[PDB]
Amino acid sequence: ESKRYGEKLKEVFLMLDNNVVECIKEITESSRNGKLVFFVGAGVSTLSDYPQWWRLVDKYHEELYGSPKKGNYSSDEYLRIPQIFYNVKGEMAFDGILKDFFQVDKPTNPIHDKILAMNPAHVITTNYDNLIDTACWKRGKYFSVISAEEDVANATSSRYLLKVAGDFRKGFKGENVVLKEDDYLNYDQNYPLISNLMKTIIATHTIVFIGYGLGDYNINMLLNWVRKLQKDSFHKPFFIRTDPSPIENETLIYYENKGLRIIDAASLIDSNEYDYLERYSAVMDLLIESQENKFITKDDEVIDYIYGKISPLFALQYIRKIDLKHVFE
Amino acid sequence: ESKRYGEKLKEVFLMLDNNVVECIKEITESSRNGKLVFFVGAGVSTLSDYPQWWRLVDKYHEELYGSPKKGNYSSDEYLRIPQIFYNVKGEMAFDGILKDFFQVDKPTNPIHDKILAMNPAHVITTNYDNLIDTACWKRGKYFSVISAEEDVANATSSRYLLKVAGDFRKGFKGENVVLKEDDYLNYDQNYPLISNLMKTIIATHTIVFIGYGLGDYNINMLLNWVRKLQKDSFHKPFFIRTDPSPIENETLIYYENKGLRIIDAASLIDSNEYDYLERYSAVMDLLIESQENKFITKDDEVIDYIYGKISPLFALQYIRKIDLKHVFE
Ligand SMILES: NC(=O)c1ccc[n+]([C@@H]2O[C@H](COP(=O)([O-])OP(=O)(O)OC[C@H]3O[C@@H](n4cnc5c(N)ncnc54)[C@H](O)[C@@H]3O)[C@@H](O)[C@H]2O)c1
Numbered sequence: 001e002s003k004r005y006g007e008k009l010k011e012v013f014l015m016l017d018n019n020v021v022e023c024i025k026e027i028t029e030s031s032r033n034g035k036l037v038f039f040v041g042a043g044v045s046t047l048s049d050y051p052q053w054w055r056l057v058d059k060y061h062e063e064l065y066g067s068p069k070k071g072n073y074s075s076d077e078y079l080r081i082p083q084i085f086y087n088v089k090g091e092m093a094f095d096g097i098l099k100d101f102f103q104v105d106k107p108t109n110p111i112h113d114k115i116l117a118m119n120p121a122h123v124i125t126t127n128y129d130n131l132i133d134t135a136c137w138k139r140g141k142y143f144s145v146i147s148a149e150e151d152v153a154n155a156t157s158s159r160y161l162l163k164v165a166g167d168f169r170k171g172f173k174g175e176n177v178v179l180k181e182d183d184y185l186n187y188d189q190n191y192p193l194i195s196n197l198m199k200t201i202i203a204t205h206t207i208v209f210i211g212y213g214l215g216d217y218n219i220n221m222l223l224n225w226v227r228k229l230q231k232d233s234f235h236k237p238f239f240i241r242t243d244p245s246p247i248e249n250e251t252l253i254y255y256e257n258k259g260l261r262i263i264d265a266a267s268l269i270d271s272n273e274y275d276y277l278e279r280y281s282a283v284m285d286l287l288i289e290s291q292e293n294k295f296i297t298k299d300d301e302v303i304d305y306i307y308g309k310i311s312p313l314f315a316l317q318y319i320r321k322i323d324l325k326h327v328f329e
Numbered sequence: 330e331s332k333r334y335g336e337k338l339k340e341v342f343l344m345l346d347n348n349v350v351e352c353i354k355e356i357t358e359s360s361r362n363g364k365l366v367f368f369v370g371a372g373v374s375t376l377s378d379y380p381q382w383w384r385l386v387d388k389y390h391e392e393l394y395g396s397p398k399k400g401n402y403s404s405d406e407y408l409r410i411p412q413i414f415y416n417v418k419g420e421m422a423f424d425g426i427l428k429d430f431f432q433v434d435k436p437t438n439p440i441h442d443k444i445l446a447m448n449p450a451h452v453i454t455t456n457y458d459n460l461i462d463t464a465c466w467k468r469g470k471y472f473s474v475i476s477a478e479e480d481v482a483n484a485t486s487s488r489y490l491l492k493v494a495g496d497f498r499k500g501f502k503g504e505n506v507v508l509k510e511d512d513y514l515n516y517d518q519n520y521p522l523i524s525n526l527m528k529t530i531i532a533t534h535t536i537v538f539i540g541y542g543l544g545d546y547n548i549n550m551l552l553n554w555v556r557k558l559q560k561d562s563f564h565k566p567f568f569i570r571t572d573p574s575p576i577e578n579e580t581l582i583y584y585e586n587k588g589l590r591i592i593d594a595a596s597l598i599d600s601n602e603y604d605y606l607e608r609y610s611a612v613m614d615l616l617i618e619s620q621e622n623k624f625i626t627k628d629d630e631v632i633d634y635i636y637g638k639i640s641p642l643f644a645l646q647y648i649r650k651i652d653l654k655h656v657f658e
């Protein structure tokens with residue numbers, strides 16, 4: 001643990017392919033320059049035992065028909081069942097179940113802290129829990145929260161916490177979040193400001209995609225928007241994938257040509273089929289410890305961390321030694 | 330069968346709900362006025378043993394990932410797996426699978442003839458097989474086939490056969506149909522005239538959906554387009570549903586509020602789990618035998634059928650006896 005984990009991370013750093021090393025090098029540089037923006041989704045919140053969306057679709061399904069579905073719900077059944085419930089049963093009944101499920105208090109997993117350990121310029125989450133807001137407040141990093149159209153102009157600070165999928169701050173109702181099918185069908189007409197505010201950060205910042213699946217609605221919509229741009233014209237987003245099985249090569253080639261630079265979590269380490277907290281932690285600790293220069297051991301590498309900090313100080317003819325402990329950390 | 334079927338259909342009609350009776354009467358009136366259009370899907374081709382699309386999505390999966398998938402493909406897999414196989418293995422292999430799977434010759438089931446016996450003014454189909462074209466040709470009905478943009482202007486007849494999903498007439502290649510995921514995204518740009526033609530036919534005619542699942546992709550786009558329209562302004566399409574299990578009440582209310590009048594084939598008879606032909610023929614025979622006046626069993630209907638034919642002739646001073654045999658057929 002104390003020694004095992006420290007040795008394991010440094011050992012895994014030496015076996016990584018050049019692609020993962022380049023991805024980590026770019027992520028660390030973006031974080032140091034101050035242009036790193038995380039994109040948290042469902043998966044960084046379920047580590048805090050937050051309910052998954054299918055557990056509410058099942059409740060809607062068994063309150064409409066009478067029995068849970070015999071299988072896993074598809075992408076259409078995630079938006080169509082709650083819409084059938086809203087149309088048939090009504091709106092107050094649709095909000096009673098939301099109040100029952102989402103009126104819970106849960107802790108903040110360590111990942112929520114690690115995301116704040118890299119100093120992200122912004123944070124773009126597509127979930128409605130206040131776990132990330134609580135973590136940011138407790139760690140002392142003030143972030144202006146933007147969960148409504150009226151919040152875009154009234155931004156007190158410069159760092160954002162854009163919740164592009166609504167929020168339950170104003171109350172536990174379905175008019176503040178995007179859950180049904182018609183909510184997605186009218187997202188660009190009901191949220192015209194948070195769409196621009198999200199598409200601008202993606203184009204003028206480094207983006208990471210922790211906590212997301214590789215076939216989500218949001219990821220595919222973002223890739224559809226990205227394909228409408230020109231030749232390169234922007235930085236390809238990084239995608240931390242933490243699924244149990246290793247990613248197939250065909251599906252990796254298919255997605256790496258659409259913009260993603262995938263960093264699979266179940267390839268640097270071997271873990272159990274349910275140890276998700278130890279798959280997020282591998283990538284996050286790899287990035288954080290790459291920031292701290294722990295994974296630096298070579299003769300030519302010390303002539304880069306030394307030249308890369310002394311070379312700018314060449315126009316000056318004689319710099320003081322009292323502040324020379326500032327050009328280095 | 331031979332003689333019991335005539336009594337069984339009459340009993341079913343006598344034991345029908347009033348909504349289905351009204352739907353059948355309106356359908357018969359539309360057929361008699363020449364304003365009936367049939368929307369045929371990929372459920373009248375499987376009666377001819379035509380290869381279902383999930384077999385191609387299974388061959389693509391087997392050739393990509395080496396082994397078949399576990400379970401049943403969702404909506405996204407129906408459009409993404411073919412797209413991944415395209416982007417990875419090339420258009421040549423994509424079309425090689427298409428030619429090997431779709432270059433077959435199947436007969437025309439009795440439903441293709443019951444469809445034509447109702448005398449439709451148009452036929453809109455999302456399948457690519459030429460089964461409906463063969464059925465039209467082998468009965469003396471001339472329909473102008475329309476499966477590409479260049480065919481819209483070069484039409485010669487007034488009765489269209491609008492294949493709104495393409496056709497393999499000009500070669501068994503994937504560029505002549507809509508099968509992938511990017512084909513569906515760029516459909517309004519690649520088929521701007523066929524969409525307008527289909528929308529105009531839907532607006533100015535009576536539509537019956539036969540062969541489509543209720544949660545189909547195509548149906549849920551027409552249902553979204555038909556909501557952007559104003560108040561009533563048109564006629565709600567008829568949907569002939571022939572699934573093995575009866576439709577639930579909530580899902581019936583959900584789709585009847587979206588502008589659909591549903592005729593459930595699994596609620597008018599008692600068929601087996603795989604007796605799809607006996608359910609198609611149970612709803613396509615009620616309409617045809619209602620046209621033939623096999624259900625008139627009251628004096629208020631015999632003094633009305635005669636009156637609807639004879640009343641317009643009251644203007645004429647005297648009609649010949651060889652025209653009374655023309656007024657009635
Ligand atoms: N889809 C259904 O109807 C259904 C039915 C029964 C059970 N489940 C279970 O719900 C879980 C999520 O299913 P999904 O369809 O959203 O796949 P998903 O990959 O789209 O889930 C999103 C991401 O959540 C992340 N994550 C972090 N901790 C997790 C945890 N304990 N469990 C799951 N994900 C975690 C993962 O990185 C995952 O990629 C799965 O464990 C699944 O077995 C789903």
Ligand SMILES: NC(=O)c1ccc[n+]([C@@H]2O[C@H](COP(=O)([O-])OP(=O)(O)OC[C@H]3O[C@@H](n4cnc5c(N)ncnc54)[C@H](O)[C@@H]3O)[C@@H](O)[C@H]2O)c1
Nearest residue numbers: 371372373375376381383401402403540541542571572605
């Ligand atoms: N639903 C899936 O994703 C899936 C996946 C793998 C295999 N399958 C198999 O394919 C069959 C149909 O799958 P689908 O994707 O077309 O969904 P679906 O059942 O909704 O098919 C659409 C329509 O085909 C009509 N039809 C007429 N004859 C039919 C026949 N012999 N078999 C099936 N439908 C007939 C049905 O009335 C239906 O409305 C299923 O019975 C199953 O054995 C389905």
